[PDB]
Structures are given as structure tokens and as C-alpha cells.
């Protein structure tokens, strides 16, 4: 009862309930759709009018869905079947992927230890920062060495340069976490009097706020089932109908140039295939608009720090706050009338030529 929880906060279930995918997937999408709409309505545009100004769109993980659906959008009357398509996909992703691999009690001993070691509260997706993709894959290959097929962990997201995300069963991800715990170094080690080459790896690692192992072999079973379900309802995405490029999460390609089903792709693109985020953000643009979840903790800023010096300028569309750095921009720029609403990030090559 989404409407109920909204009206009487008193009745809203635990974060634990709200976060598990079957209800969290669809809701997140509604949040994104909802943001699209405040931007569209407040600009004086139709859904499609907004969409026309776009060189293209793309989502990260489950965000791919709304990007596809957003580009199929034309007029307000028509906007709603587009909404239906999006959230009825997310709903099935959520319901079926949960069924495939549902969270089970963490041995309190593990939770205890993982906590007094400043790591997260064990979940199906670990995020490792400041390690080569190669470096990370190395440690996981080691960890996986000792485990059975059904307990193995893989790279789910290559969000960026030295930023990755491994995923699998929480307990085996905790195992990787231990093998890592010895290989690192206390953050305030002060290796300033040690010669550079000779110094020790400092790096960050934490569990992410998610109930399920996205982009892992744990979910492959729900793949065929979800699609079989997607067909049993109105949902499908014809390349004819998408009006602007929707960059494939793995390829970096367009989803329109596709022999088979575009629906079936983005399902397998969220459930089984990795997200090579930088390669999927191949495009060139002046401005990137972030409609996805979580203010400055969200996808926009991540992609921004990937691009920094290249003249791309990210704007967080869902949060009216203030950046002390003007590193990126918040909700305001999208609507400002002054020349103050047209900011661009430097391209060092040009600026300092």
C-alpha cells in the first residue's frame, strides 16, 4: 500500500522491507518517472517534448528500464501507458529475482565482526574503491577458488576507473572481505617517509544498500521466467517506437540496432550481464541530467568524477541543494533563466592549450 505509507508515515514498514527488491525496484522507478515529470511539467513541455531535447538516454543497472520507456514517450494522454510499461517491468524484475535468491539470516557472528571492522552490514553487493579492475578480479578469483559454483562472486559493476562492485551471496562476499582485510592498510598510516614505490595499498570497501545480487549468476534462473511473464502482459519495446538512442549497458551500443527483443535485452542486461559504465557512457555531450535515485549520492556525481576534465557537466535533477565547489549542479540549473543556468565544466585540453 504505497499510498497508505505516504499518507501516514506511522504505517510505513521498516527500511528492511522497503529495500527488498520486489517493492523497491518498482518504487525506485516511480521516483525516477516522477522526477522526469516535475522537470517536464515545470518546463512547459510534454513528456516527448522534453525527450526531444535529448541526444539520447541510458540507465545504470535497473535504471536502463526507465530510459527505454522514457524515449517511447510522446503526449500526456500517452504518457501513462509508457509508465505502465516501465513499472510493470520493474515489478517483474523485483518479484522474480527475489524469488530466485531471497535474503536469509546472517549469522550474527559475521554481522558482529563485519561491524567492528568498519565495513558495512553484509549484503549481496560489495563496492571496492581505488583498486584496478584487474587487481579486484584477482582477489575475487582467489576467494572463488575455494567455493562451489553456487556460492561464487563476480564483478557486477565497473562503475569507473578504480571503482568496482563485486556481487554474490552475502557470506561469500564477506569471505572476499576478509582476504582483503589483510591486504590493505590503516588509513592514517602516514607513509610520507616511505619511498613511493615501497608503500602499501590504501583502499576503501563497503557493502551497498541492496537486498539482491544484481548482475550475477544467482539470478540467471529468473531471466527466462521474467520474459515469459513480460509477454503475458502488454509489455514490449519496438525499436520503431523509441525516439532517441538508448545506450546498451554492456555494449555501449544502441538498443535499437538489435536483431531480437529489446525488452529481453535490458532484462538480461540488469539480471546477468555486468555494467561497463564508462563504455556505456561512450557518448559525447555538454550536459548529463540525473533523474535517478539519491541526490549527490546518486549516479550523476559518479559519472561526473569519471569525466571531470572533459567538458561534460553533470546536473543532479532530483535534489535542490548547493555545491560549495560548483563541481556539478543541482535541480536549479535545469530551470534557471539567467546566464546563471548555463554553466559548463572546463575541458583542460582547450582551457590550458
Amino acid at each position: 500500500n504505497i499510498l497508505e505509507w505516504l499518507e501516514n508515515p506511522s504505517n510505513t514498514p521498516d527500511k528492511d522491507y522497503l529495500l527488498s527488491i520486489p517493492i523497491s525496484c518498482p518504487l525506485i522507478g516511480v521516483i525516477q518517472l516522477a522526477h522526469y515529470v516535475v522537470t517536464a511539467k515545470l518546463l512547459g513541455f510534454t513528456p516527448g517534448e522534453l525527450r526531444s531535447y535529448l541526444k539520447g538516454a541510458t540507465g545504470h543497472s535497473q535504471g536502463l528500464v526507465t530510459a527505454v520507456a522514457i524515449a517511447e514517450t510522446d503526449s500526456w494522454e500517452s504518457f501513462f501507458v509508457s509508465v505502465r510499461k516501465a513499472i510493470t517491468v520493474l515489478f517483474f524484475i523485483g518479484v522474480r529475482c527475489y524469488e530466485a535468491y531471497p535474503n536469509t539470516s546472517l549469522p550474527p557472528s559475521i554481522l558482529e565482526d563485519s561491524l567492528e571492522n568498519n565495513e558495512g552490514v553484509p549484503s549481496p553487493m560489495l563496492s571496492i574503491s581505488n583498486l584496478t579492475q584487474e587487481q579486484v578480479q584477482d582477489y575475487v578469483n582467489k576467494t572463488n577458488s575455494h567455493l562451489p559454483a553456487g556460492k561464487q562472486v563476480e564483478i557486477s559493476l565497473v562503475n569507473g576507473a578504480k571503482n568496482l562492485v563485486v556481487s554474490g551471496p552475502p557470506q561469500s562476499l564477506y569471505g572476499l572481505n576478509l582476504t582483503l582485510r589483510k591486504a590493505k592498510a590503516p588509513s592514517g598510516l602516514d607513509q610520507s617517509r616511505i619511498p613511493f614505490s615501497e608503500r602499501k595499498l590504501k583502499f576503501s570497501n563497503r557493502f551497498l544498500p541492496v537486498a539482491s545480487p544484481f548482475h550475477s549468476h544467482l539470478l540467471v534462473p529468473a531471466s527466462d521466467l521474467i520474459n515469459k511473464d513480460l509477454v503475458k502482459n502488454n509489455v514490449s519495446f519496438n525499436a520503431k517506437d523509441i525516439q532517441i538512442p538508448v545506450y546498451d549497458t554492456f555494449d555501449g551500443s544502441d538498443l535499437r540496432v538489435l536483431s531480437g527483443s529489446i525488452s529481453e535485452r535490458i532484462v538480461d542486461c540488469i539480471i546477468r550481464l555486468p555494467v561497463k559504465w564508462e563504455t556505456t557512457t561512450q557518448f559525447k555531450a555538454t550536459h548529463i541530467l540525473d533523474f535517478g535515485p539519491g541526490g549527490a549520492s546518486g549516479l550523476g556525481v559518479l559519472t561526473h568524477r569519471n569525466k571531470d576534465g572533459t567538458g561534460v557537466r553533470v546536473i543532479v535533477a532530483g535534489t535542490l541543494d548547493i555545491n560549495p565547489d560548483d563541481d556539478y549542479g543541482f535541480k536549479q540549473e535545469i530551470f534557471d533563466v539567467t546566464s546563471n543556468g548555463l554553466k559548463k565544466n572546463p575541458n583542460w585540453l582547450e582551457e590550458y592549450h
Binding site: 559475521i110 582467489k142 575455494h146 569471505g175 572476499l176 576478509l178 589483510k182
Partner: protein
């Protein structure tokens, strides 16, 4: 096999192992590996005056079980009757 028969046999096997242990060498490395890896002991308790066989099993863990332990998320605990009374008898401080 008949119970009485099993005894009789198992008996002489036991006495054989003990008699000849005298000459054959002590395969402790292989032994530790049996209970450390095949059995995956989490509490190995040494019953002796001082912690000699313990630090033995401890080195063995660092030397070989470094990775195994990590992945399989098994917390091992190595206790000597000599020095770790509290932990064996389950009687702690506050």
C-alpha cells in the same frame, strides 16, 4: 561385520599402531591437515603443560590456511589448557 569380531580386529589394529609408533616417524604435519582441512575444526584444544602443539597448529594456519579460512569464512580458535582456561571452561570476566 559381527560386533564382537569388529572389536577383536579393531583391538589388534589399535595395539599395532601403538607398538610400531615407536619406530615410524611422527606425521604431525599430515595430521594437522586432517583436522584443520578435512574436518574444519573451529576449536582445536591442546591439553598439555604449555602451548607447544598450539603454536604449531597456529603457524600451520598462517603458512597454509591463509586463503582457505578467509573464503570459507571459518573462524578458527586455538586454545591451550595451560593458558586459556577462561575460554575452555566458558567462564569470563564481566
Amino acid at each position: 561385520m559381527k560386533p564382537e569380531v569388529e572389536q577383536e580386529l579393531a583391538h589388534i589394529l589399535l595395539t599395532e599402531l601403538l607398538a610400531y609408533q615407536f619406530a615410524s616417524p611422527v606425521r604431525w604435519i599430515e595430521t594437522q591437515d586432517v583436522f584443520l582441512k578435512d574436518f574444519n575444526t573451529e576449536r582445536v584444544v591442546e591439553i598439555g603443560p604449555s602451548p607447544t602443539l598450539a603454536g604449531m597448529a597456529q603457524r600451520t594456519l598462517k603458512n597454509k590456511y591463509e586463503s582457505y579460512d578467509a573464503a570459507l569464512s571459518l573462524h578458527r580458535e586455538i586454545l591451550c589448557y595451560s593458558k586459556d582456561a577462561k575460554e575452555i571452561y566458558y567462564t569470563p570476566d564481566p
